[PDB]
Amino acid sequence: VPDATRIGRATGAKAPEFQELYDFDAAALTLTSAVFPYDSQIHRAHVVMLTEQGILTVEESATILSGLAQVDELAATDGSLRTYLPYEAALKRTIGSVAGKMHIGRSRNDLANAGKRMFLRDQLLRTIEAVIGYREAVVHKAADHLDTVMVVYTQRKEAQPITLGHYLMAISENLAKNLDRYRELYARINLCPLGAAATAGTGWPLNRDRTSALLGFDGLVVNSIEGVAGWDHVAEHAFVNAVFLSGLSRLASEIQLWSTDEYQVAELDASFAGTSSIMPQKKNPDSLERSRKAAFAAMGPLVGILTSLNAIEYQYSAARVELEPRSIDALIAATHAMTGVVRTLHPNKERMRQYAAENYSTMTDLTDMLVRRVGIDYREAHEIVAHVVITAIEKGIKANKIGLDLVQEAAVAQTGAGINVSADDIKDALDPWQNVLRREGKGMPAPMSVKASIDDAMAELHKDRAWLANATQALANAKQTLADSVQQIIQTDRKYL
Amino acid sequence: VPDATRIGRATGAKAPEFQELYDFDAAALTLTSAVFPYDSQIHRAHVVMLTEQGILTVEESATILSGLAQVDELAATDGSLRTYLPYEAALKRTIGSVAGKMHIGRSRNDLANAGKRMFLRDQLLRTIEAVIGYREAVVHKAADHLDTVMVVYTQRKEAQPITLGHYLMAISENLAKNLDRYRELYARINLCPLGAAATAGTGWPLNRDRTSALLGFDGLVVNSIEGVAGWDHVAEHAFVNAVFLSGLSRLASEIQLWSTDEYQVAELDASFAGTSSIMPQKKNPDSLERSRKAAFAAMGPLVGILTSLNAIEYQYSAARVELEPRSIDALIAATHAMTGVVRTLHPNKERMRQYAAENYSTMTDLTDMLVRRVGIDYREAHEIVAHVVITAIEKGIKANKIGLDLVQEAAVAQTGAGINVSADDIKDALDPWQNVLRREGKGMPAPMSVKASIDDAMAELHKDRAWLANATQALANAKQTLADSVQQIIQTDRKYL
Amino acid sequence: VPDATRIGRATGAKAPEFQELYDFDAAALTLTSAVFPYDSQIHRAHVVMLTEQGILTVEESATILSGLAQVDELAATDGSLRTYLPYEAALKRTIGSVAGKMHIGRSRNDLANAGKRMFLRDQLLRTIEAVIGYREAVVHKAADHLDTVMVVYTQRKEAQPITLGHYLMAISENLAKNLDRYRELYARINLCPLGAAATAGTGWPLNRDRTSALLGFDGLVVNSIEGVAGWDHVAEHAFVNAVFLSGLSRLASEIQLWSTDEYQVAELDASFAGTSSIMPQKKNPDSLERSRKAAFAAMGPLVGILTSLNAIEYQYSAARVELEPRSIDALIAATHAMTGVVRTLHPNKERMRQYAAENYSTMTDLTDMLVRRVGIDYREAHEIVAHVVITAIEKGIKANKIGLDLVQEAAVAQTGAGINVSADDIKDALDPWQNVLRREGKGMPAPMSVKASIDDAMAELHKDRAWLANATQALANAKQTLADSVQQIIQTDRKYL
Amino acid sequence: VPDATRIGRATGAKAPEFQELYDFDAAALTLTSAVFPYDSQIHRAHVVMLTEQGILTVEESATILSGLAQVDELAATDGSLRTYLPYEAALKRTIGSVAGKMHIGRSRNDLANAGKRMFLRDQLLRTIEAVIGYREAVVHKAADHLDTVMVVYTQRKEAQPITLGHYLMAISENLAKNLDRYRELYARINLCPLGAAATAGTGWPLNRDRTSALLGFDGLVVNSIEGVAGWDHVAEHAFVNAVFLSGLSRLASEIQLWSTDEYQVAELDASFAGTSSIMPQKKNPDSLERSRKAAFAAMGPLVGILTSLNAIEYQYSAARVELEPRSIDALIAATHAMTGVVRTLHPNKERMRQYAAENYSTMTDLTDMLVRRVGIDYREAHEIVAHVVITAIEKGIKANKIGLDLVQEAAVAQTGAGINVSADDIKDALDPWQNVLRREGKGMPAPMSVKASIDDAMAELHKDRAWLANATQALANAKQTLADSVQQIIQTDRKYL
Ligand SMILES: O=C(O)/C=C/C(=O)O
Ligand SMILES: O=C(O)/C=C/C(=O)O
Ligand SMILES: O=C(O)/C=C/C(=O)O
Numbered sequence A, B, C, D: 001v002p003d004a005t006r007i008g009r010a011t012g013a014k015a016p017e018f019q020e021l022y023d024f025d026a027a028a029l030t031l032t033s034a035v036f037p038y039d040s041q042i043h044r045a046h047v048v049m050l051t052e053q054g055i056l057t058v059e060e061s062a063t064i065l066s067g068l069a070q071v072d073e074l075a076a077t078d079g080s081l082r083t084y085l086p087y088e089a090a091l092k093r094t095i096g097s098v099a100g101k102m103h104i105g106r107s108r109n110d111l112a113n114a115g116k117r118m119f120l121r122d123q124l125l126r127t128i129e130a131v132i133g134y135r136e137a138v139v140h141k142a143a144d145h146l147d148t149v150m151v152v153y154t155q156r157k158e159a160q161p162i163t164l165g166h167y168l169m170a171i172s173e174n175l176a177k178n179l180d181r182y183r184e185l186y187a188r189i190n191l192c193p194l195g196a197a198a199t200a201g202t203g204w205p206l207n208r209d210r211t212s213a214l215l216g217f218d219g220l221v222v223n224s225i226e227g228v229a230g231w232d233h234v235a236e237h238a239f240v241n242a243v244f245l246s247g248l249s250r251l252a253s254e255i256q257l258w259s260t261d262e263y264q265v266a267e268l269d270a271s272f273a274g275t276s277s278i279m280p281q282k283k284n285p286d287s288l289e290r291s292r293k294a295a296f297a298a299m300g301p302l303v304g305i306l307t308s309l310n311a312i313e314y315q316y317s318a319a320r321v322e323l324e325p326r327s328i329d330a331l332i333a334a335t336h337a338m339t340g341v342v343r344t345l346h347p348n349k350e351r352m353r354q355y356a357a358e359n360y361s362t363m364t365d366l367t368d369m370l371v372r373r374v375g376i377d378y379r380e381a382h383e384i385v386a387h388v389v390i391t392a393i394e395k396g397i398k399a400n401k402i403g404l405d406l407v408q409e410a411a412v413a414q415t416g417a418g419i420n421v422s423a424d425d426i427k428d429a430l431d432p433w434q435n436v437l438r439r440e441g442k443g444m445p446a447p448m449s450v451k452a453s454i455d456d457a458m459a460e461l462h463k464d465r466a467w468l469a470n471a472t473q474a475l476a477n478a479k480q481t482l483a484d485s486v487q488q489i490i491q492t493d494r495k496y497l
């Protein structure tokens, strides 16, 4: 059975990244099912620490640890075992009364806070990975379009000539700062609240540092109230998602206008567009609009979470709103979709140049030339060139057809006086590519300036990947260190007891 | 004329911090009037750079710079001159046509982005200052209440014994992370977009680094589109305000419950409470409720800003929502009010202790003691002690009156078997102060543990103040460097030209 | 296997309404799966109308209609068939090329708008039913507590004496107005956009009224753009949900304070409370806090939907955010939970009376008595009684122990003059039940006044149920009328063709 | 001094409605100053009722009423007198101790709730007036453009031919339903809470109906708790503002795309456009973007209000967020601005027609013609015409140049078979005006169908104005009835006492 939406102008298959936008909602896990595997890691790390602190015997610990493996497999198909007390009771039915001792010095409150942090932690690295891939495609695309002259817009009106590469590097700088936000957030998510128990700690002599290290945390949530009442990292995760996706909506919207039947300065790759069930001419920006949809929806969790925090005391509370898997899955799908949109975008270079040459985005350079050549102030030069545009539009004269006669008329009609410039000055001022070349300072569209920004971004991207690789490897090491400690307890018991 | 609200139980005057909550709304500036002084600084810094780049003659520059001082004073009483083009036109009427040259290589777009950043920058240091003062009062208050035994709550139910000092250090840790958020934000606000002009830079050879340095920025917004389209720092400023104030609402709510007629474990200082026009018995938490009001209201700008970014392209746009002075003023007023609330709070130490001793928050330690002494698992010990509580409540027996007989009954009724513990074990387990002393690990309420957290917080507070002092001094130095460069141009012209 | 959370003080099973709060998230349908059955109703109603308009032959219509039944059953187990074009293609594979004719004069745009309206329509009647059951329990509970004297609070401080019945009838009036909001919304949801096709209608001679009537709509969305671009009913549905649940959060919060260990003026029924895995004394308000959680979360869809509308043009758009089943399911679960909370709530009548008599909520009546008996203005009487309270608190004198001596002292100390009232006047003024009886105007807590409000509410509830019964029956009639028309076409073909 | 922004292409003056967008922020009142005049009306109405109930003597009443006039005039220049207790104290200093008796049976709680309702009530009629003027301009504009053929868009892609009049009547239907929302809200705002006093009523025998009638309310908020705790009408006012403005943003956005340099199918009137300080060619949609800005900002109050309600109990609370004058003023300014935008919009009729004829929006009619003429199913006809478009685009053939040859090729290439249609069938199918004429059902763009919608809208507008006139006159009558009752008391005292 084929994809029934790939009819008419919707040729070929959906790009896989495009298809993600349609699949994440039905495939998303509940928070309970997403967090459960991390809870079972906490059970092991907590039991190991209890053993090392002499609170559990090795026999007790080994019996518990082996039971966890059994119940975990039961919970793979029995969802009722994915919350704590049902899980603890199933462990009791599996290994006996000793199961109850794994909760010594512990509560559902610090267990849940820690487990949710571990889930958000992995999802944050997953997000940073996707955002890096987004930035990579943006920069790589820019490197191929240093000569792609086109107009930049302000207030949805043509402003001045730039290049497509110059535009994309604005997105690169946006993404660099959102990656900073995410990395800054990671340092606050990756703190271990275990040891706070209900909210006040415990009399049992826990080693909170050992539990934290075994679970991959880089530090503690120290105060025990903050350990269970702390929720700002959840709100912040929701916010960075929201603000990052607002910039993704803006690019999607920008490309959607580029790809209107009226602009026709860019076209979506067939693999990122759909069509209509009724209108055969439609090549619809489904990828862009469903990406924006996800950006709008990300407003919801942010408001729900902050509302819930505004509604309570500084306590553990079951009334706090969560950041759910389906919200994060939507962000990833949208980020992947726009990664592919950018990679496969087809700019219409000729029409881009045509607009730059014909639709008066070069008038600023004409104004600047008057100021530079004859020394009038900018406001006076501005009034003259404005008159040029008004007259040119009235007469149907494209910007690249503006000449000495029209400029002299405007100056006379506006000041009563001619103005001392040549037809070559005017010609050079109205050449959109010369407009680009002259804008060669930092962050400006001249190829050498955009090229420099690309070089800096490629260096920053290397550091982005390095930060991600180190954070990921640190978690993998701790997770392996924990698995080793678990088997060693089990082997010690099997061998000597 | 006296404060007519200070009647009956509302004795004395409002604390000044309390009064701030009533004054900020009517006293708040428009964004235009708040940003205008920074725009005039930009005019000077931009003109200086134009002069150093040989774009303006010294005569032109000096004439402009002296005119700015004149128009600035006019704008002190003529609000119509607080937007750019009216200001430029007034400068033209004051010094002549040369006024128009101060806009060379510049736009309202990068002028406004930079000016708003300078405003938010100062307001961010103002906020960091206030939050530091908030944390100082919280830590200083904690240092005086290491022995103030009281219950901590979870889900608005008494949980376990702690101390007031232990609770306040949860707030200290919350504020430390919000100070990190604010400092992280500062690095993104303190970037200079000047030189982007409309959105694509300019052909004029500007020195963007010089303009940035003269205005106190620590770096550039490089890409010219990002310079004018960039708005994420505004959304982020709104967010940190929102999440920080949500924690302030939670403390306000916590104290409001403490100070209910039913809890009576704390009382507001008369200078932070009001009364009713009809009910003479009322001592109302006006300070707390208007502080929460400001926290709820801070949700608004965050949503408005993010909505506006989700609604546009990655362009300069006049449709973007701003963070306004009155919102920031509300945060400061609430932060100052809660600073004073915490400083002057009157805890009722005797009733705090009474609840800890009588209302069963010590049952966990009783449970832990069974596990420790006889070795039963925690779940079984938990069921027994639960039976103790049920029976004690039925019989009207306060927790500190629970003895050997009642514990043995519960064990028998629940397991058919007695349990091997002494009356001294039970007595020690139900002593709320011993509950506190036993919780002596990291972040737990034992005095030595809270004392350690205070010591660390005092060290962190020293670094908070140091970061603030350095950031503030850097702006003062640049502002003085700019004033010097302005006079030197004016003096050079007066002397030689 | 038993409910492992029902341990210790969590006796018995969860009330079913309580359990709903734990089940709705994992059980919720996607919007696609929830809307799909309504789409298949639209296919039938649209085909019937095409037949009656002579666009389809009876043979064609009968073949299509019988195929719909076959594909519907396939889609019961094949989720891929729950969007239109896969469904249309499966119908094609089932009955042949004629399947494509069911889309004549139609689009996915007006099909989806109509199908989602039908879904929200049924969910709105479901919500109105639940809210009615909520109000019924509130009023019925009030009828049993006309004598249950207790204090009302303002700003979380005891204010004046009322009754529990009086408080609950405030909730009844709140719910009456939310039922008006919902009924007003229903009239805007129950409009049929079918016939708009893509956005501009069609050349085919459709009978839009017939399609609308067959699907239970009470009218048309006339303009074809509004038919597909119209989305305000979705935003409004989200809003009424949000504001209704904010009042439910406020009642939940009110009861949670009542049931604190410090108030102890009400207690949750065991079937609506939980306990702690660590603290055996906990009787936790899980029902209340998860109900508030749902109220906070309802903020999310409202913001997401409105953001998406603010982000587009007045067009059909795939970027619009939806109101999803899981959000509505959460509201129902919370409404059912609070319905049972109210029904089974255990007020502590004796302690309610004690607070009313002892904690100075009667001071207003004492003030009013001075004004009435000696004729002083209210502000002067207020200052005297305030002095009474201050002195009584200082001396540890409960309000019901205030006598002639203390009142005369305050008057002297405050005015230098005694005051002409008797000890019987004071006694009557400080009697909390007399406070209630004297408040006998409209909407006041006196039994006869609350009884009147109950009578009016019982009459309004009869009209609520009548409106719901009529709306529900109208849909059932249209749905049966449609099923009949479908079989008749099928029978006509089988018999004559 | 001229408007310095009216330079270059920004010719003439701003339209006054355009200028409103720049003035409302600095001119907006605080809520305190906006509500104060209504509070003084309440003082009079409450005193009158106290007199009629025999609680005040005529001498007392007359002395108070005359003092109110004096203090009101003082408060015109002394803002400190615009809150109750300062006002009451100034009245005391003016007429003596008797001033305190105006507060008998009353609180700041029900005074403030009622006063804010009266303010929102007037602002709601002001809003309904503005929205009516908005709808009038939309319908009147539509009546002049029944022949203005143009394409409608879906997903920002050309869809099918319509007319400008047809598009505007979608807005008319949107506004009709928002007027229903506002009128429905009015019935809930226009309820009087006076008589609730603090929250529990009073022992004084007030006539709540008389006070309500004197102040223009159409009924009571009955229950006294609901009278002071009730806030849903504030949230609802914020919501209708938000959803109404979201539709205004969508029209603004739609027109902004129409007026891009690339569409060029409409142009703003010079009086609703601005220009750039740097780019002389700019004709900027400042009116549209600042209108959308106000729509985004309206999200803020809605979220702040609902958050505050979610944060409290069902009590009077000072923590509740308000709907402020500046938010309402922004809506009015945006509504007035878009009223003028629509009135003065310059459609480019020739280019509108050109797009309709050339850019393939007529392909649906071509598809429908195949189905109608040869009887193939719609999906097969759709695939053929899709092939026509693909081939036509490849060959650069405008839609109106598609002929018999190209259609036969597509049919052959796609089915191997020709198709039995004439060149005249194709020609008629591709004629965009015939596309419009054929869409003649209800709500479709055919002139006779749009004309009918206009006739119905003109009838509905007459009823809109009639509802507004009646509501306004009812308030004017009550306000005059109150002024008369005040003088009569004053005259009775002056004459006989
Ligand atoms: O699939 C449809 O029926 C319409 C799609 C569109 O609006 O382009
Ligand atoms: O000032 C009043 O009238 C009431 C205050 C309160 O509710 O406590
Ligand atoms: O279930 C727990 O571990 C704690 C519950 C509570 O905070 O009361």
Ligand SMILES: O=C(O)/C=C/C(=O)O
Residues within 6 Å of the ligand: A154, A155, B106, B107, B108, B109, B198, B316, D275, D276, D277, D278, D279, D282, D284
């Ligand atoms: O006024 C300016 O400087 C730029 C305006 C624009 O972006 O069009």
